[PDB]
Amino acid sequence: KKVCQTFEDHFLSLQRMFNNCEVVLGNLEITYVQRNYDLSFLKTIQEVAGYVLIALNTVERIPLENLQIIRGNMYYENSYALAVLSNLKELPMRNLQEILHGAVRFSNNPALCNVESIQWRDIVSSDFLSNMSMDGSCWGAGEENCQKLTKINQCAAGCTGPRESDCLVCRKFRDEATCKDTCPPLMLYNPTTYQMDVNPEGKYSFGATCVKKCPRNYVVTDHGSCVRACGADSYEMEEDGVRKCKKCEGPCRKVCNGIGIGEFKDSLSINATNIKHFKNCTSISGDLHILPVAFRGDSFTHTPPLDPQELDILKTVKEITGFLLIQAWPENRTDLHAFENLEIIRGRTKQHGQFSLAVVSLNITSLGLRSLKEISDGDVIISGNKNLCYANTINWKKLFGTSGQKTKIISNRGENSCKATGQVCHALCSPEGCWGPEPRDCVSCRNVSRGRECVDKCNLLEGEPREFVENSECIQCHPECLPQAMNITCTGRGPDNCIQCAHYIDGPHCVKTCPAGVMGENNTLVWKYADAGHVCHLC
Amino acid sequence: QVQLVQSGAEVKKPGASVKVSCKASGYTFTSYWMHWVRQAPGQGLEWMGNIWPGSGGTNYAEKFKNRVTMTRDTSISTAYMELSRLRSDDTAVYYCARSGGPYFFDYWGQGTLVTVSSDIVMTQSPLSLPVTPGEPASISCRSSQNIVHNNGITYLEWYLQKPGQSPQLLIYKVSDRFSGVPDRFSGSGSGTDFTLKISRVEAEDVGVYYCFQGSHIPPTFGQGTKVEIK
Ligand SMILES: *[C@@H]1O[C@H](CO)[C@@H](O[C@@H]2O[C@H](CO)[C@@H](O)[C@H](O)[C@H]2NC(C)=O)[C@H](O)[C@H]1NC(C)=O
Ligand SMILES: *[C@@H]1O[C@H](CO)[C@@H](O[C@@H]2O[C@H](CO)[C@@H](O)[C@H](O)[C@H]2NC(C)=O)[C@H](O)[C@H]1NC(C)=O
Ligand SMILES: *[C@@H]1O[C@H](CO)[C@@H](O)[C@H](O)[C@H]1NC(C)=O
Ligand SMILES: *[C@@H]1O[C@H](CO)[C@@H](O)[C@H](O)[C@H]1NC(C)=O
């Protein structure tokens, strides 16, 4: 079945996006059509995965006879699957025998005849709370077009035999011919591996049907369905032959243009008009300039002064293909907290064709560039910061990628005074360096690291989350693994890398509960119980 | 303190080129626009283009776009204005102003008189209005279009060019008065009509008042009312 996602211009676009459609994955909306211009533009539609909004239609007849069912995945306003209103004389939705979710709204239709007598009881399903059908079973057009009553368990409209393999429209999904409650799972449990495994017979979900792979440009989501595009919290990534909607690692890639190229080609800095154009933005394409004109304001460019609280918009930036110039910062902030998440400064286009990181003449105590790890092309100049203390500690040669890069840290707070005022980084910090006064602002640390912050040592013997050390880092092991005082509660990651499990253990993997009711091999559910030794045994 | 110094005392010939400097001191010269404004005799102040010393990105007026070149000297903190193909009407007084944040041309250069010889129209309803010391005066100004900028801030300004000195900002906004000027001046108006109301005319108040707009691409001044004592 083919699928789809001035008044003259409206009809053309509508007919274009609906002439070949047979199953609509979205909402069928026929609105604003002029007199005597509809001519079999949409007659083959048999399924709408959403709501059917036929509003303000001057045409005498909107053909929708084949329409078998409206899914109701969306609504017009609320619980509104069929929205026929303010139109239209003949609307023969004869095949319409089911509206899973939503109700039909009848309003402002004086010309609509032969539809007030329709049996909406057989179509609308359990959504009568908002059924204002107020504007003999026959949709119209004399005979032939009748309501074909059938209602007044996976077949929605009707049945053509007492078999699930033969029905008009499946209530939930249709693998290839039989009506299934859900699509074959993509993960299959195998008692031999005591865990989940990719299921070959498992098929992705394509709207109201199950497909081994989704054709055209569709992206499989986490729950097995392949929607048209990945969500806001997900990104498109193609591992195997089909791309999948992998979850974004926090704020994922949103490449915007920086200062010098694009809409900010003639802009000088990130002033108030610039701010908000960098919201939830990562991997700036261009340079990032923060000049005094931003906070002072500019009259010639007609830009109000940038209030310092809007500088947190740049907290999303994790890469800058150009350079970072901070010639002005709010004086009430002791560090560049807007660039704490910045990780790479490619420097492709550097200040004066030289500096890619330039913190100049600021009133900040620390740099606050904890996540900064790579400065590829340009060098670094941190000067004029009369209150900058933890600046020379960082081994800049580690971040640099090109051997020719240098660093011009000069005229900041003296190191002698820096250590005299008690402003020396934490002892939990490898000589590699420190970005600030706390272990969070540490390039590297003496023994371990719990994320950005690094403690004295992992919870190998005592601790609340009971970390286990690996590659000089604290990893909180599976919660299932109970704390162990004699040795280390957990050898490694996963529920199969600890000596003692607080909850039951399925084979080698400690689990909250033994696997019960999960789909297993040969399309058979598997259930497991627990013995006195907390081991999960197959039933 | 901020102090902008121009070369001054320039005399040229028609068809020649003149270049004047602006030694800007007391502040970071690269953090502020360096506007250039001309005051031809018989006419009010006329904007002729600016420059951003931090990057050298200059803007221009349509009457000087193909005729004037402005370049900055970052190391010595001095902006320049080169006017070529001088005509008979090019004789004027050239000021190197300095754009602020809520206002325009906070500080002005003393002025360079280049005497050479062989757009939202802002018009002030009065012209050379005489008053008596003590009696309140009122200078109205009419704009050709609505100068309320899209951002919601109208860049209406009143400049008092006292005899022998450069223009000085009095009302930095439609009504917001500048720092260092008395409460006597009180700008007023909205939309298209703007009037400046002096509550008490004093001896020092004599001078030419120019209603200025900066909300359009070319900033334009008004003809100027020569307020004088009766
Ligand atoms: C403030 O940012 C805006 C852009 O957001 C800059 O305004 C641009 O200015 C150039 C000329 O300098 C014009 O060609 C663009 O059309 C303007 N863009 C917009 C959106 O108005 C402005 O320069 C910035 N101000 C400072 C002081 O950097
Ligand atoms: C510039 O930074 C300094 C410190 O680097 C600020 O001085 C601090 O002001 C805070 C205000 O809460 C005091 O608690 C500190 O004791 C001060 N520290 C020092 C070392 O003097 C100074 O105020 C900043 N300048 C501003 C905000 O204009
Ligand atoms: C940016 O993305 C975040 C993600 O949480 C969202 O909440 C926010 O509204 C977005 N901002 C804009 C301006 O689109
Ligand atoms: C590990 O921690 C101990 C105790 O705090 C400390 O003395 C030692 O220096 C650390 N190891 C390294 C390699 O720095």
Side-chain angles (χ1 to χ4, degrees), chain A residues 492-503:
Chain A
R493 265 180 292 243
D496 56 300
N497 263 321
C498 34
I499 304 99
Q500 282 234 336
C501 320
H503 309 82

Side-chain angles (χ1 to χ4, degrees), chain A residues 263-264 266-274 277 293-294 297-298 300-301 303, chain B residues 33 52 59:
Chain A
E263 63 185 342
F264 325 103
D266 304 285
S267 299
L268 310 158
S269 100
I270 301 185
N271 35 300
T273 72
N274 270 32
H277 297 209
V293 254
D298 207 19
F300 174 79
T301 68
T303 64
Chain B
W33 287 99
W52 177 260
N59 308 53

Side-chain angles (χ1 to χ4, degrees), chain B residues 117-184:
Chain B
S117 292
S118 60
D119 301 14
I120 294 192
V121 172
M122 307 279 300
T123 162
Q124 297 175 237
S125 307
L127 221 181
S128 82
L129 62 133
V131 277
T132 292
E135 213 269 318
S138 191
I139 298 111
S140 164
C141 165
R142 263 273 326 151
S143 63
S144 78
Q145 336 173 3
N146 176 45
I147 71 147
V148 173
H149 199 73
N150 327 309
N151 62 348
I153 282 146
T154 166
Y155 293 110
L156 200 282
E157 281 168 58
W158 287 91
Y159 294 81
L160 168 53
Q161 166 135 219
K162 305 206 186 150
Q165 336 160 35
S166 50
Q168 62 215 72
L169 182 50
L170 300 185
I171 319 296
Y172 84 80
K173 286 288 192 58
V174 54
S175 38
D176 310 2
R177 190 177 57 242
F178 201 45
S179 86
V181 286
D183 206 358
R184 304 192 298 273

